[model samples]
Target: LPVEKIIREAKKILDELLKRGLIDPELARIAREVLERARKLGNEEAARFVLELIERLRRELS
Candidate 1:
């Protein structure tokens, strides 16, 4: 699979996990931290993927 596809699927999976309560708040926080680190390390595609995930979750959860 391509990187873009992987990123999209990963974001979707994470969003689904969040919606289904498969991941707790602590786990989500840790995941955010990891994503932030990846973002800071210049993982632009991953950062974009995670940012999309966060935005979607925020909107859907609200």
Candidate 2:
């Protein structure tokens, strides 16, 4: 998917999970920092980074 397409959706989903307290602090902290840096960088690799983080977060979440 296009980076923006992938990122916006992932971000929304994660944010919702976050707001509901579904995610814990340590990883959420890491995700927040990466999301900040990822969104700003706005590149393919940054999006990939988010995807990878999300993958790990998903694994841990479950």
Candidate 3:
């Protein structure tokens, strides 16, 4: 997938998790920063990695 799409999806997922009180605010903030940097640098792998991590964390917590 394109980096832009991955970044958008990551943000959307994180936002939903944060809104649902399923993720820590601090962690979400950090994720956003990391995603932003990845997007800026066109780091698709890092973006995908972060999204995967967030999904795993969400599943574990839920």
Candidate 4:
């Protein structure tokens, strides 16, 4: 969990980005839902794959 800080920090950045109108709110909300699904699954591989897809999805919305 050495990179845990980075993860939390990134979350903070993301939240601010959304607040600043840098990221789409709809996509961020969906991202949160997807994150919950990934969290509940407890599958790192699936989580990584989904995270990648989420990034793609967010990019598409931009």
Best by lDDT: 3
Clashing pairs in 1: none
Better of 1 and 4 by TM-score: 4
Per-residue lDDT of candidate 4, residues 2-62 (tens digit): 2333334345545766886878778667766665676666666655665566456446656
- Clashes counted in candidate 1 amount to 0
List residue ranges in candidate 1 displaced over 4 A.
Answer: 1-24
What range of 10 consecutive residues in model 1 has the weakest lDDT sum?
Answer: 1-10
lDDT (CA) per prediction: 0.62, 0.72, 0.86, 0.59
Clashes of 2: 0
Each candidate structure's TM-score, on Cα atoms with residue i matched to residue i, is 0.47, 0.57, 0.84, 0.55
Q: Model 2: per-residue lDDT, tens digit, 1-55?
A: 4776767766776776687677866766777677767777778787877877786
lDDT of 4 at 30: 72
Which pairs of residues collide in candidate 4? Answer: none
lDDT of 3 by residue, 10-46 (tens): 8888888899988889988999999989888887788
Best by TM-score: 3
lDDT of 3 at 20: 90
Candidates 1 and 3, the one with greater lDDT: 3
